[PDB]
Design a protein around this ligand. Structure first.
Ligand SMILES: *[C@@H](C)[C@H]1/C(=C/c2[nH]c(/C=C3N=C(/C=C4\NC(=O)C(CC)=C4C)C(C)=C\3CCC(=O)O)c(CCC(=O)O)c2C)NC(=O)[C@@H]1C
Ligand SMILES: *[C@H](C)[C@H]1/C(=C/c2[nH]c(/C=C3N=C(/C=C4\NC(=O)C(CC)=C4C)C(C)=C\3CCC(=O)O)c(CCC(=O)O)c2C)NC(=O)[C@@H]1C
Ligand SMILES: *[C@H](C)[C@H]1/C(=C/c2[nH]c(/C=C3N=C(/C=C4\NC(=O)C(CC)=C4C)C(C)=C\3CCC(=O)O)c(CCC(=O)O)c2C)NC(=O)[C@@H]1C
Ligand SMILES: *[C@H](C)[C@H]1/C(=C/c2[nH]c(/C=C3N=C(/C=C4\NC(=O)C(CC)=C4C)C(C)=C\3CCC(=O)O)c(CCC(=O)O)c2C)NC(=O)[C@@H]1C
Ligand SMILES: *[C@H](C)[C@H]1/C(=C/c2[nH]c(/C=C3N=C(/C=C4\NC(=O)C(CC)=C4C)C(C)=C\3CCC(=O)O)c(CCC(=O)O)c2C)NC(=O)[C@@H]1C
Ligand SMILES: *[C@H](C)[C@H]1/C(=C/c2[nH]c(/C=C3N=C(/C=C4\NC(=O)C(CC)=C4C)C(C)=C\3CCC(=O)O)c(CCC(=O)O)c2C)NC(=O)[C@@H]1C
Ligand SMILES: *[C@H](C)[C@H]1/C(=C/c2[nH]c(/C=C3N=C(/C=C4\NC(=O)C(CC)=C4C)C(C)=C\3CCC(=O)O)c(CCC(=O)O)c2C)NC(=O)[C@@H]1C
Ligand SMILES: *[C@H](C)[C@H]1/C(=C/c2[nH]c(/C=C3N=C(/C=C4\NC(=O)C(CC)=C4C)C(C)=C\3CCC(=O)O)c(CCC(=O)O)c2C)NC(=O)[C@@H]1C
Ligand SMILES: *[C@H](C)[C@H]1/C(=C/c2[nH]c(/C=C3N=C(/C=C4\NC(=O)C(CC)=C4C)C(C)=C\3CCC(=O)O)c(CCC(=O)O)c2C)NC(=O)[C@@H]1C
Ligand SMILES: *[C@H](C)[C@H]1/C(=C/c2[nH]c(/C=C3N=C(/C=C4\NC(=O)C(CC)=C4C)C(C)=C\3CCC(=O)O)c(CCC(=O)O)c2C)NC(=O)[C@@H]1C
Ligand SMILES: *[C@H](C)[C@H]1/C(=C/c2[nH]c(/C=C3N=C(/C=C4\NC(=O)C(CC)=C4C)C(C)=C\3CCC(=O)O)c(CCC(=O)O)c2C)NC(=O)[C@@H]1C
Ligand SMILES: *[C@H](C)[C@H]1/C(=C/c2[nH]c(/C=C3N=C(/C=C4\NC(=O)C(CC)=C4C)C(C)=C\3CCC(=O)O)c(CCC(=O)O)c2C)NC(=O)[C@@H]1C
Lengths: 75, 266, 162, 172, 162, 172, 172, 162, 162
């Protein structure tokens, strides 16, 4: 489980030096992503590594696209 | 666009470009191509030295530790990106470079300049850069796995028409890069919500005949003029002059207090 | 936290680089400043109670209405005074942390980030804390490098507040 | 990230107390070792390529199965990846030596490396052995009394030794 | 450019921040180092011609084939020897620039970036230049902080070439 | 950007020769001036909010038309952008003071500011007046004699004054 | 992904020796079969819409609960998604037939498909029934004797049948 | 891997398209080339040992210093010679793989990517391997399509090394 | 547009590489196909009017309602018939372009991209054009590689329409 070196921004906030793994399921075609140029490849459990400072953004992104955050684990 | 306008505008390669998606179980050469595409487009087609390569970021991309979007973000936040696009550039030029590199388009509004300026002033370079990559626009166009590509030459949803025209001010050709501190070409255009005529590829050239001088070269002078003589009919003016009359035309424009916006070979 | 040593490492890691002579010079500068910072922190924490009490009293004198009008955000009652003295102690303690660390990192980490929306939420004027920090500046009695570094951190808090 | 100062700051802030006289004295002693710490970081950095390359060659001298065809170090890309990893571990050890705290090496390089190496099929024991070889080379270079104001560097060498052991134990 | 002052301002500007005590300590380390760095640069400058000739001869001694086998990439003829002496002079001159600037920034921008493509295209062995740098490091006749800073730049180039 | 050292280095590299003795002594003279340079940077930084607010207050006092409705500093966002511009100019002046070179101020702040203002209708002359207010406010702060070691800071004051004038000239 | 040649190449490189004469002769037999491989690919591609549409029609005639309201193929979006899925599976089966290896089909089509359908509630058994109907239509199109140079195409038909069964087994 | 069939499928899949006549022509070109490529791989395999020893000996003749200079990267002792023959055997074997696969895919996958880091790290000059590949191209003794395809892979490896 | 030669170059360019044996085999496949494609285009060109008229007549026979229902989208009057013969001629002419080019690139660039929303906005049934293409398939009288390539383009259009 690597990634924290590049995921955590170069800002030296101790709060920001924390990454978390999101497990997302059911990434469906919804009205929110009708004009998505790319196509969904997997609707099962996908793992997204999110730094602390972007956890606000990512979960919103997951929630607009119908994905279900089933688990969140410290990295 | 179609071929007939594409050759004239010099955007044939952009039109025929295919989005590059890192699929699951990709081989080594696919990751190599994806890394190369990200370096080409995020760093604005510079000759990237091997010593400037992000060895750890591309290792995480290779080993499936991070997504293409994360690798794009790592390149955008890297000191290499800072050096060639941020530390020696004005803020407005810097964010149009961000729009070109990260979203593949030109800025649409002066409010987008007002945004990312306050955001820089409050939250630093990192928050300002993360605004583009975490934006709704980045998610529907590129997602987590598609290398960003230039989209300003094609009709997008929730797009202003000026974007297409302004695209030619930020994309100067296939063999061009964003390397030289330079000021934005879109400053006055964005601030006053205007559009500039597109002079790209073969669009800039005009007929010469016998009117051009000794060396058969015409120059187009786009100027902003007011009444300082004869009546001025338009605020914007375009002058086509030969090389032999270029200095004289420039000097009489200067003594009338007219502001020269652009000079191009026609 | 933002400190000379960690910022040097973070920017070297951003470039995938070993620590060159530039980072070594940053560490040398940190070493030059470190003894004064440690001596300033010790001196500040010795009479921290007197400094906090005097700073709280200075705020009360500069802003008498804080001790008079009723309200959750005012120090009219003992609860408000205890909350106020605890806040001044928070400011002074994090300043000593900044002196120890060698940068404004503890202030940014623990105090500065989010202070304005705390002040807006709880209707605390930043001018109160500015007066407290001004008293701490005027009565710490430090000299030389220790005085300059402690005042830089105190002025950083003041500039962030105002 | 933490350095030697912000580590005790974080502990003190969590307890909400000022640093005591003993903690400040320990930090003062750290400052008194600062020149030696900078020397150790400088010496490892100036010999980084030699340490990594000599250790890798020694690591392939014994344990030949890594470089035989079908081995993990076989093919140019995987050899380059192995060499890259040795340099990365060494680079983060120098970061840890510079900061005086092991947070940078653990958080950015060590945490999650064992599972990553298991998923790729990278032998954790062999890369730990390479780290041990990098340990021995770096400690000899740091403990080189020629061309330096001679002194007692036992404390900084022990810290460097601890960082190398931390790298080897987290990767195995 | 990788120099402490530009580094400090780059970090602050990227953060959109004023120069705090962290940046001041960076400047203090730069100031503590600069005179030794400047006189190392002058010591290297005054002995530059002899150092380059001696470094060139050391490369020719360790790799005798470079002075015998014909080829554009070798120093068999006087043209190749001039190219070799010019290259070693380039290495020494940008090293003095590094000492003046207090960091590896001159080496990165002028020499390190893209040197691998150069040595591959014109089939020049980087080991030759490593030998030249080792001679310069062993014969610059510096001491103390001057030696330490100069050796760091020379070893930075050595590590870059290998 | 360049600092006081890299500026000499870049010119020398383009010319392709070593720094002469006189250039080395000039840089050494800059080095001996360094503590006062750091003190001036620290003093402007420590009073930066006061400098910006007092200069802005004085500027709006003598130019009531900036804050008059329809004026360019009217509405909260424009007024906040105006205060941000003052703060930005002051910050790059401190950066230029710190580096000893005006490149960071020229490249990041002043390049394109004039025609940005002209395009947007921000009165550059009024911006120049505000910058001039920050000028003397900061020069009194840098030259304040109490609580500092005494010495001649006239050269540093002239350099900081030059940065402020360069900014004032660029915006107008 | 691999093709028929790169599969044995990768196996040989991992083993670390040259391709044997038997492997080279077997690949020559594959080259001999190559014309029939190209013809099969072309025949399936030329009837791609017919194969997908006819198989979908058969899959909805029997098993009508898919297209009944509340069924997984009900609504235009889900029905279009179902048709796109049949076309995608057929397209990757042609890819595997073209390459002579199922790696493209496994890695880029069938990987995670079962988990995707379990998470969407797509009846993967019904998808397998539709894939079998596509299989039988595709096989009788490939084996169509008129308008083509007669020959034994049993081997290429068996390979295509194996790819179809592989897709059906992965989704079921 | 960079083979014609996989590239055709890759470009077809990137557009989400079925295989059309363009991809069919790619396979037809692959079929035209495959038998010549296959006996070439067979001929190279049948003469692999003599070619590898002859290429190694050619490198030793063109660069005599590698035969008698002490160092880990040189072939002075048997260890270094074995390593050299093993490297040349790697080159020849992957070239046969490229002939079988019909593209530079095996060279890219196994040898080309990361070769310059290896050469820099272990101080091995690519000129040695260029001469070995030159010997292979001059003495493998193929003709026609087999020779042209084999020469293309050997020249591809030579160009990557230089 | 999509041809074996152009796609080979674009794939190589996106990877920043020279054309290797893979692209050479692609060109060889193009050469093997090109003569048959050219003479297929010649045969379709010579018989263009009979093919266009017979296909148009066939569409009218299988869809008689198009000949007596009034409307802009139908061929009841001469104007509708003129548009229909022109449309089928467009299909046939672009198919000849594909045979010349060796790929569906002419069909994609000129006809296929945007064909569906044209049929939707002008209420043109794609089944009409499918029957026209089926007549051309059944009546072109080509053989061998010519028949195979030409039919691949025709039913590529059929697949895009259906
Ligand atoms: C163990 C690490 C070894 C050791 C170290 C040692 N060093 C010093 C003192 C100094 N070393 C430096 C270092 C540098 N000066 C520079 O300009 C640079 C480049 C940026 C470096 C790395 C300095 C400034 C000093 C202080 C002055 C001096 O030269 O003495 C000591 C002396 C005690 C002290 O810590 O100050 C020691 C012990 N000595 C050994 O024997 C080990 C092999
Ligand atoms: C039809 C009446 C005439 C015509 C049209 C035509 N337009 C284009 C191309 C573009 N049209 C636009 C316009 C917009 N894009 C937007 O997002 C918006 C809304 C805010 C507008 C108004 C743009 C930007 C383009 C170029 C990019 C793109 O094509 O997507 C074309 C194609 C030109 C080509 O060569 O491809 C055509 C044909 N043409 C006529 O002859 C009619 C008179
Ligand atoms: C060499 C014969 C001469 C020379 C060259 C030189 N070029 C640049 C910089 C660039 N070159 C290009 C060109 C391309 N990039 C592409 O992607 C394409 C393919 C479509 C082309 C043709 C570009 C865009 C640049 C911009 C910078 C970049 O890094 O990409 C330089 C660098 C200049 C500088 O570093 O400031 C140089 C030196 N210079 C000579 O003196 C020779 C005559
Ligand atoms: C004293 C200067 C004036 C004053 C004080 C006062 N403060 C509060 C409440 C809070 N103070 C804080 C501040 C901090 N908490 C932290 O964690 C830190 C950073 C480490 C700081 C600086 C917070 C968050 C609160 C609200 C939550 C809490 O009560 O702990 C109060 C109470 C206000 C209320 O609504 O309860 C008061 C009275 N008030 C005065 O009149 C003094 C002049
Ligand atoms: C010039 C505008 C004014 C002035 C300055 C001045 N300062 C010094 C000397 C020092 N100033 C410092 C500064 C700091 N020490 C710290 O710890 C920090 C905070 C982190 C700072 C900013 C230092 C280190 C010195 C040297 C030691 C000493 O204090 O003597 C001088 C003396 C000459 C010198 O260059 O050292 C001067 C002249 N004096 C004035 O009168 C001006 C108003
Ligand atoms: C060398 C001593 C051993 C060895 C190494 C080896 N590692 C990999 C692959 C990876 N290594 C990492 C680790 C990191 N990347 C980073 O950026 C950092 C810092 C955050 C670390 C610690 C990763 C992420 C990978 C995967 C990506 C990649 O392959 O580059 C390989 C290659 C495995 C493969 O190609 O499948 C190898 C060979 N192998 C040995 O046998 C030695 C014991
Ligand atoms: C000397 C140690 C050995 C040697 C030298 C040699 N070098 C070249 C050619 C070039 N050297 C460079 C290097 C640089 N140019 C720069 O601008 C810098 C950075 C400041 C460096 C390090 C370059 C670019 C070239 C090629 C272009 C040129 O001709 O200048 C040659 C000639 C190669 C040729 O084919 O002409 C030689 C001979 N040769 C020896 O045998 C020494 C052991
Ligand atoms: C205040 C003293 C005067 C004033 C200011 C004012 N400025 C703007 C707008 C901008 N200012 C800048 C300048 C910068 N932004 C940066 O990030 C940098 C540093 C790298 C600089 C130098 C820019 C780019 C803008 C435009 C974008 C933005 O809106 O932020 C405004 C707003 C103008 C408008 O809203 O149209 C104002 C009000 N105005 C006065 O009247 C004072 C004299
Ligand atoms: C049709 C025979 C059956 C059926 C199908 C059905 N599938 C989906 C949704 C998805 N199918 C996939 C699969 C893939 N997408 C790809 O790009 C590839 C290549 C890797 C494959 C194999 C995916 C990912 C989805 C979900 C996202 C998307 O739709 O793009 C649906 C829609 C489910 C929903 O609720 O939206 C349906 C209906 N359903 C049946 O009843 C048939 C048996
Ligand atoms: C097998 C399932 C069926 C079958 C096939 C078959 N085909 C051939 C020979 C050829 N087929 C082609 C194909 C094409 N030529 C083109 O131009 C195109 C478009 C790009 C295609 C698809 C070619 C070139 C040949 C060779 C020459 C010829 O026309 O014969 C054979 C003969 C053996 C061989 O391997 O070549 C066979 C057996 N025949 C059946 O009966 C099956 C139903
Ligand atoms: C022979 C032409 C010259 C020579 C050879 C030599 N090579 C090494 C060491 C290595 N060679 C490689 C190369 C590869 N490994 C691979 O897996 C592949 C791709 C399939 C290649 C091309 C590597 C990685 C090494 C280092 C690791 C290892 O020991 O295997 C040496 C020994 C170097 C050392 O330090 O011991 C030698 C001697 N030497 C000559 O003098 C010849 C002219
Ligand atoms: C004939 C099979 C049936 C038929 C034909 C018919 N078509 C139109 C109108 C148009 N046809 C096209 C098609 C194309 N234009 C192109 O540029 C190309 C690609 C090169 C194609 C395939 C278009 C765009 C139109 C509309 C614009 C135009 O009129 O040209 C009509 C008239 C529809 C109308 O409203 O004008 C008709 C009648 N009609 C039948 O009944 C046949 C069965």
């Amino acid at each position: 489980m690597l990634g924290q070196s590049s995921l955590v921004g170069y800002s030296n906030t101790q709060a920001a030096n924390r990454v978390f793994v999101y497990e997302v399921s059911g990434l469906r075609q919804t009205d929110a992503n009708e004009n998505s140029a790319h196509d969904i490849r997997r609707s099962g459990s996908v793992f997204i590594k999110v730094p602390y400072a972007r956890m606000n953004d990512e979960m919103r992104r997951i929630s607009r696209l119908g994905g279900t955050i089933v688990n969140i684990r410290p990295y | 666009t179609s071929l007939v306008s594409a050759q004239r505008l010099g955007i044939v390669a952009v039109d025929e470009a295919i989005p590059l998606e890192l699929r699951s179980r990709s081989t080594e050469e696919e990751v190599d191509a994806v890394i190369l595409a990200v370096y080409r487009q995020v760093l604005g087609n510079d000759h990237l030295m091997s010593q400037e390569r992000l060895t750890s970021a591309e290792s995480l991309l290779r080993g499936r530790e991070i997504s293409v979007r994360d690798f794009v973000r790592a390149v955008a936040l890297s000191e290499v990106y800072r050096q060639k696009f941020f530390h020696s550039n004005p803020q407005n030029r810097f964010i149009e470079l961000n729009y070109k590199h990260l979203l593949g388009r030109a800025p649409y509004d002066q409010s987008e300049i007002a945004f990312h300026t306050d955001l820089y002033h409050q939250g630093g370079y990192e928050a300002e850069i993360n605004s583009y990559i975490d934006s709704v626009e980045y998610t529907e166009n590129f997602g987590d796995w598609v290398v960003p590509y230039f989209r300003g030459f094609a009709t997008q949803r929730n797009q202003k028409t000026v974007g297409f025209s302004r695209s030619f001010q930020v994309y100067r050709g296939y063999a061009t890069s964003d390397r030289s501190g330079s000021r934005s070409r879109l400053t006055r255009e964005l601030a006053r919500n205007t559009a500039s005529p597109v002079y790209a590829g073969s669009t800039a050239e005009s007929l010469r005949g016998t009117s051009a001088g000794s060396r058969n070269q015409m120059y187009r002078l786009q100027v902003i003029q007011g009444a300082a003589g004869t009546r001025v009919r338009r605020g914007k003016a375009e002058y086509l002059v030969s090389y032999d009359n270029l200095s004289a035309k420039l000097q009489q424009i200067n003594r009338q207090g007219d502001t020269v916006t652009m000079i191009s070979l026609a | 936290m933002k400190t000379p040593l960690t910022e040097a490492v973070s920017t070297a890691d951003s470039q995938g680089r070993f620590l060159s002579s530039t980072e070594l010079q940053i560490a040398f500068g940190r070493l030059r400043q470190a003894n004064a910072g440690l001596q300033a922190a010790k001196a500040l924490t010795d009479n921290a109670q007197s400094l906090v009490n005097g700073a709280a009293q200075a705020v009360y004198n500069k802003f008498p209405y804080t001790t008079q009008t009723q309200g959750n955000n005012f120090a009219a009652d003992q609860r408000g005074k205890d909350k106020c003295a605890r806040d001044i102690g928070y400011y002074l303690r994090i300043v000593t942390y900044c002196l120890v660390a060698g940068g404004t990192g503890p202030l940014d980490e623990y105090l500065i980030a989010g202070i304005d929306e705390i002040n807006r939420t709880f209707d605390l004027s930043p001018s109160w804390y500015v007066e407290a920090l001004k008293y701490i500046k005027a009565n710490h009695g430090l000299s030389g490098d220790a005085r300059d570094e402690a005042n830089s951190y105190l002025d950083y808090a003041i500039n962030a507040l105002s | 990230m933490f350095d030697v100062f912000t580590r005790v700051v974080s502990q003190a802030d969590a307890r909400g107390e000022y640093l005591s006289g003993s903690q400040l004295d320990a930090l003062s002693a750290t400052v008194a070792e600062g020149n030696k710490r900078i020397d150790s970081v400088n010496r490892i950095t100036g010999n980084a390529s030699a340490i990594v390359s000599n250790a890798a060659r020694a690591l392939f001298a014994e344990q030949p199965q890594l470089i035989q065809p079908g081995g993990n170090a076989y093919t140019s890309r995987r050899m380059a990846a192995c060499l890259r990893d040795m340099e990365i571990i060494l680079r983060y050890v120098t970061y840890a030596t510079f900061t005086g705290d092991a947070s940078v090496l653990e958080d950015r390089c060590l945490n999650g490396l064992r599972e990553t190496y298991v998923a790729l099929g990278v032998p954790g024991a062999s890369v730990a052995a390479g780290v041990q070889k990098m340990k021995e080379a770096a400690l000899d270079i740091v403990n080189d009394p020629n061309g330096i104001t001679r002194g007692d560097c036992s404390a900084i060498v022990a810290e460097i030794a601890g960082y190398f052991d931390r790298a080897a134990a987290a990767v195995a």
